[PDB]
Symmetry: D3
Subunit: 279 residues, 6 copies
């Protein structure tokens, strides 16, 4: 398979400059009416799950003929500070939609509302019914990858064949998830990309669609990305450090993780701090 | 009055078998899309309120020419672990409707949402307006039984006659409550009966209507019931022990009781654990 | 400007009588289906913000050629026990609408829901867009009074002129806020006025509109008011003392203040205690 | 054993009318406020609202035995939830309004509610506790041990002993554990108020301890639905449900009754918490 | 009484501009961080944002008296809610950043906020507290006792005494309670930082105690809207509202200001809580 | 320095199959329940799930060095969040199931999780802590000090000293701090159970301390993905992720793993909290 540029050196913005940029980001969150986050494997490295195209990334290790390292199971992985921050942004109405490429299930398990998430590449923990299209979010990883049969049957009242939701190398993106994602991206005045290299054809382009009709793009990545030149702001730092500085400037706590929890529909919005004066 | 079979010996399932059955129940809660609970006086014995047809039950004591025992007032009675568990099941979306024969007011006082409860036999604590059909949930028991005048007047803007809601021996069941209850029972793939003997004509039949079109019935009672042969699972144990084991297997806390609280309309659903893999 | 009667002596109801009246008020809250609060500067004196027409009030001090005293900034002012009590009344459904003359921003900052508040005289902390009528709730006081330009521009996607929302001496009342307020007052069976003298022409009359078609008026003020003769109950005491006694009789806690928080839309109602028996 | 003296059983119940009841609970609040040293004495009446029948009440174990009937249990000892009264006493210890607690119940619900073991004397023992014959070390288990009358359970001591574990349930001829009796006698002796909840006070050492408070000026309060052995020695008798009494009392004191996290053992009392200031009295 | 020395009243207020204000609150944070022993001294200025007028401020009791006017109260002593400043000091004690607290206020709001009585010296007394003439025992009441100048209230001691209860409000000629002064003098003497909030420091023993910190190297900080007696002895003077200053300070320290559960007395300090690690300084 | 003995690096990992894994975590729960004195020994394996690479694991610093590669950090030491394992150990101290904690990590996450410093021995030091050469006083900072090998940071002591502040990071030839080693040796000596999480036990004083538990009857448990120096001395070896093991263990114990409020220092352990009653064993 065509696996794109792997193992680029990383960039570390100096602290003075890094604080300047997170204040810029905060201003843009404040200035905007419609914010989408797009997330990749990078938001999960700090919970012990390796990325694909970083120094110790799955593709990168393969090329040096090495195995990537897991410091946790998918089951025992805890959502990062960045995961819980996105939960809080959605709950106070500063985050309209969230689009993720990750198959690791941590967005859902963090208690992010499923009706505001597009899982572009699917979910280790989710089976679909080949007959009635019903989704089961399970407590362990299903067992298969590539939309093959798990050997469990639908229970609605059906007995249809349940399959995995992990695309293989030629599978089309789920249409509902891709549709919602394209809508959210097109109709945004701010897209922010966290821990994605933006190299995958459909998924990595959607942030650019925010730039059509005047909208700002922000990119938060340790490595260069495919679209660095299209950004209004590029932040080279650990997303956790970036996201904790950001919540602090927004006057928002990062909520505790109750443990693995599914929320299907978003709850009505909670109160948030008032906006600073700007310009 | 025709008062049915009273004082049957009780059954105690051995522990090994009891744990096997509560795992069966949990599987059925997991497998189902539409769960109704039906509750009788048995869920209230552990808060000091005696049942009707048990060893020390009101009807049973009468026959041996004895008085039944109250270890609490209706006012000072605290909802049981089983009451608070049903509150939590509704709040995480594992319980669609609840149908109760009890007049003791503990469902409402536990903070169960009234728009998801049918009080088939009425409520010590509730007056209705004979004119505009408005319901007042009071902090003490009204004073009368049999739909007679309390001597308090409606306050909407009416001055109509407020009466008790406790049926006497020939009164028809409230039509709205009976209607909602029959709907919830018919359109369920799982009914579970807790602390009811199922001997009363309209009320005790509704669980059977779940069995039409493929639906499962579960019965949790210390004594035999009228419908033991129709069940898919029979659990002979204390509902509190059963319900605490069940919540544990579902990965759900039993909430604290804030004290006496009326919730008219159900709130949108809270997150719940993901489902195990089954078969 | 015509500034009305200033500096009247205050009245202090004796304790026996004061407790009798707060029990009367509580009965009326219990008896009613539709309660509006109207609030003036008096609910803010206990957080260090002086009133207009009291002994040490802005107008009153001017006449004796004195400056009124601020013991806090608008920014550092904390909502009073009366503010947080009104938050709790709205959240348990005992308060339908709230109408305030205060420009101090404490209702909004207490986390009262904006869709249930009419700010009749505007808000130090709020800018409006002269073009698209969009409102920005800021974290500091805007800088101008009298609907003049702040020198900040709209950010929707507009670049329109943002102005203050503080009426000057001839400006018409905001039409949406006045409209909602007149509706809420007309269709109420109980209006309660807290810390207002009711001297301002549109604002001070709205409580009277509750008295049309049988509705009760209650007035809580240390000084005489314009409309004392129209009231069913007059309570001469500190609103904080009155409101804490009231919540106690209603069996309701006064919530902690999380700090400055904007809630745009009201959340669905929380459970409340059941009603006593009355007459 | 069989011929043992089981006392007066099944006496009629008394119900103070609502008026006389509120005035009495207000009077108790006053005695708590006025007192520098409050001991509580509890019996099986604090456990009936959690599904456990008493001994000498209308459906009490002894009372049903005399009529040839069986007491009814509405739960196991394991699934039993501490009452409003149990949780209210945890709080009174946590704000310093309760010096000591002396109970005759073996149901374990005091310990399971999180009451600190160093401020409680379990006069008749505890179904959940086994001792070591050698070590004298106490294990608090998540289930009932199996035996009564201080017999070997089948488990051994795990200090590093391998000594014999035994139940703590006294039999008819068995003396009281000397440590619990001694602390209970001291706490009762130097109390300026004893309040007895759900006990009829017929058992010889246990039922007399509140009288030791009445020597040297101390006040005694008896809350019970039936007459009790010492009704004549009381300064205040309250005929009502201990839950109603304790919920009113706490309300007068301005204290909230704590949630029960589930079965939880606390060996040693934590330092005191803030409590409301005292009303002005006379 | 009438002729008594009431000091300089109604001085003009000073307002540090926003810039100079943030730099000064950052400088205070640094002094807290650097110091192993922080005492606070409070006066009536911490109580004005809760509706209680001061003595020597523009609308202060003495200041209005001199012009022939009356001070205004925006609440009773009973309905008065502790300020952001009161609750912030509770927290600083709970994380170990405050060794002792020395207040001249008689409004009781320190005690009512849950500040532990063993780490606070009530130099001028407390409206809510009566002593026993005989016992010397202190009762903290839910309402103001009635009298000032150490006169009998009409209540008697309830230790088991029947001794005379008296107010603790000092009069003009009355000495300071020796215990509170002694602890305040010790805490001030061995402090390496004293911070004074809302006091003008004119009263002779009370106002001098922060200077005792300045002997043997100690730093003194004065936060006050008006000049104060000792402005010249300070290492840092902050002209702003004590609430704004304390809310900024806590934010710099990474501490949250606690909710007030309502009127609550705590006799003895609880053990310390975790607090954020220190910034690197110079 | 360069030639130093770095031990066996990059050994293969072992994965106990699910069945054998649950039976082993149940067996550990039993050993905790049976034991009166539990010490934990932690190494860099408890920090890998928070983005910090270990030393001798497959991508461990030493292991990558040997292959000519660089270890990867998924966060700074400052933005690093304590793991499920870190927070689970805080709780076990708070309910009295953990007597002492002995760690070889310099990452500071134990202290930052709110683990009380008086029940923990930081054998190899702490990036966030500077000592005073003169005072021997320790400052816990909000950022990493700058240096390793006990060299001057550039800051001075603020006790009132002006002494030299130094890092606490041991170098290759540096002895262990005598106080931490002494407490660790005592706690290990008198423990009836040692449990080692994420250490390969190759460092000479630190790795041997769990063996001191095995003298005079004590049980030793090793939880580690790779073989360790002392695998043969263990009574129980668990090959799995320390998070999975600790989350199962806590569930068996009926304890919840606490939220992390953010970076918070606690000098002295608080008194114990209630914990569930013990299961009946054999
Ligand atoms: N803590 C961190 N902070 C910031 N950036 C980080 C961090 N850790 C890693 N990164 C950066 O995070 C970036 C991760 O980029 P890639 O590894 O390509 O992941 P994707 O989500 O874009 O891959 C998309 C799909 O391709 C796959 O085949 C699967 O199908 C995926 O679903 C790097 O550039 C790191 O520098
Ligand atoms: N803790 C317990 N766990 C399980 N079962 C229990 C428990 N306690 C009691 N039971 C069982 O609980 C069952 C209770 O059954 P019945 O007493 O007939 O009550 P109903 O609600 O069905 O009576 C319906 C109406 O009839 C009346 O006239 C009123 O009008 C009622 O509204 C017994 O079989 C006990 O074994
Ligand atoms: N703690 C207290 N408790 C009760 N009453 C109080 C308290 N404190 C003060 N009061 C009473 O509170 C009353 C305050 O009345 P006014 O001062 O006229 O304020 P408004 O809101 O009615 O003025 C309306 C507009 O007029 C202005 O020009 C602005 O445009 C305002 O928006 C007094 O009668 C006090 O006795
Ligand atoms: N809800 C209630 N509220 C108040 N009182 C109650 C309640 N329920 C019951 N009572 C009263 O509670 C009282 C309980 O009286 P007894 O049953 O003799 O209990 P003991 O603890 O004194 O028995 C001591 C020993 O006797 C044995 O030999 C064992 O060794 C026991 O340990 C009754 O008078 C009820 O009226
Ligand atoms: N919000 C505020 N922020 C800051 N400072 C304030 C504030 N409000 C007022 N102030 C200042 O707070 C200061 C208060 O000064 P004084 O009123 O003399 O109070 P004391 O506590 O020193 O009086 C001591 C004794 O005097 C009597 O005889 C009694 O016995 C008293 O106990 C002023 O300078 C205000 O500028
Ligand atoms: N998630 C995990 N679960 C369980 N074990 C793990 C995990 N991740 C890693 N491990 C294991 O964790 C183990 C860590 O072994 P080492 O890296 O030698 O750490 P130390 O603390 O013993 O090094 C001591 C000193 O050595 C230096 O010189 C410094 O001075 C250090 O302080 C491996 O065996 C992994 O298999
Ligand atoms: O602790 C004693 O009983 C246990 C506690 C208890 C209670 O608190 C309330 C109640 O309604 C019943 C009740 O039965 C319990 C019990 C204990 C046993 O050891 C036992 O064999 C049994 O069948 C049942 C006990 C003590 C005694 O001294 C005694 O003589 C006796 O017969 C029993
Ligand atoms: O404690 C003293 O006053 C009380 C506290 C207080 C305050 O904190 C702020 C304020 O704005 C006013 C204020 O009045 C209070 C007060 C106390 C009385 O005893 C009293 O008779 C009264 O009318 C009112 C006091 C002490 C004094 O030494 C004194 O000389 C005096 O006149 C009064
Ligand atoms: O504390 C030591 O390192 C720090 C802690 C640490 C860790 O916990 C896990 C990890 O994956 C890497 C790691 O690097 C840290 C570090 C410390 C330094 O002082 C330093 O100069 C550096 O580059 C990086 C240390 C101790 C040593 O004894 C030693 O010999 C050494 O080289 C380093
Ligand atoms: Zn299907
Ligand atoms: Zn009607
Ligand atoms: Zn606009
Ligand atoms: Zn032993
Ligand atoms: Zn005395
Ligand atoms: Zn030093």
């Amino acid at each position: 398979a065509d696996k794109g540029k792997c193992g680029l050196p990383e960039i570390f913005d100096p602290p003075e400059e890094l604080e300047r940029k997170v204040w810029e980001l905060a201003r843009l969150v404040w200035q905007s009416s419609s914010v989408v986050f797009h997330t990749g494997a990078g938001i999960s490295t700090a919970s012990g799950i390796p990325d694909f195209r970083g120094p110790h990334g799955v593709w990168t290790m393969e090329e040096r003929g090495l195995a990537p390292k897991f410091d946790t199971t998918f089951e025992s992985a805890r959502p990062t500070q960045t995961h819980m921050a996105l939960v809080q942004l959605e709950r106070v109405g500063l985050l309209r939609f969230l689009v993720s490429q990750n198959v690791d299930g941590l967005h859902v398990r963090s208690g992010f509302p499923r009706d505001k998430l597009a899982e572009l590449h699917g979910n280790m923990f989710v089976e679909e019914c080949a007959k009635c299209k019903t989704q089961y979010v399970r407590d362990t990883v299903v067992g298969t990858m590539g939309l093959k049969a798990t050997g469990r049957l639908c229970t609605v009242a059906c007995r249809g064949e349940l399959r995995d939701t992990i695309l293989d190398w030629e599978d089309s993106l789920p249409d509902r998830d891709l549709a919602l994602a394209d809508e959210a991206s097109r109709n945004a005045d701010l897209s922010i990309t966290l821990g994605t290299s933006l190299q995958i054809r459909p998924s990595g382009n959607l942030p650019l669609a925010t730039k059509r009709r005047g909208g700002r793009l922000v990119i938060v990545n340790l490595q260069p990305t495919k679209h660095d030149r299209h950004a209004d702001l590029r932040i080279h730092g650990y997303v956790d450090e970036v996201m904790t500085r950001l919540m602090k400037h927004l006057g928002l706590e990062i909520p505790a993780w109750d443990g693995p929890r599914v929320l299907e529909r978003a709850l009505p919005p909670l109160p948030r701090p008032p906006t600073p004066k700007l310009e």
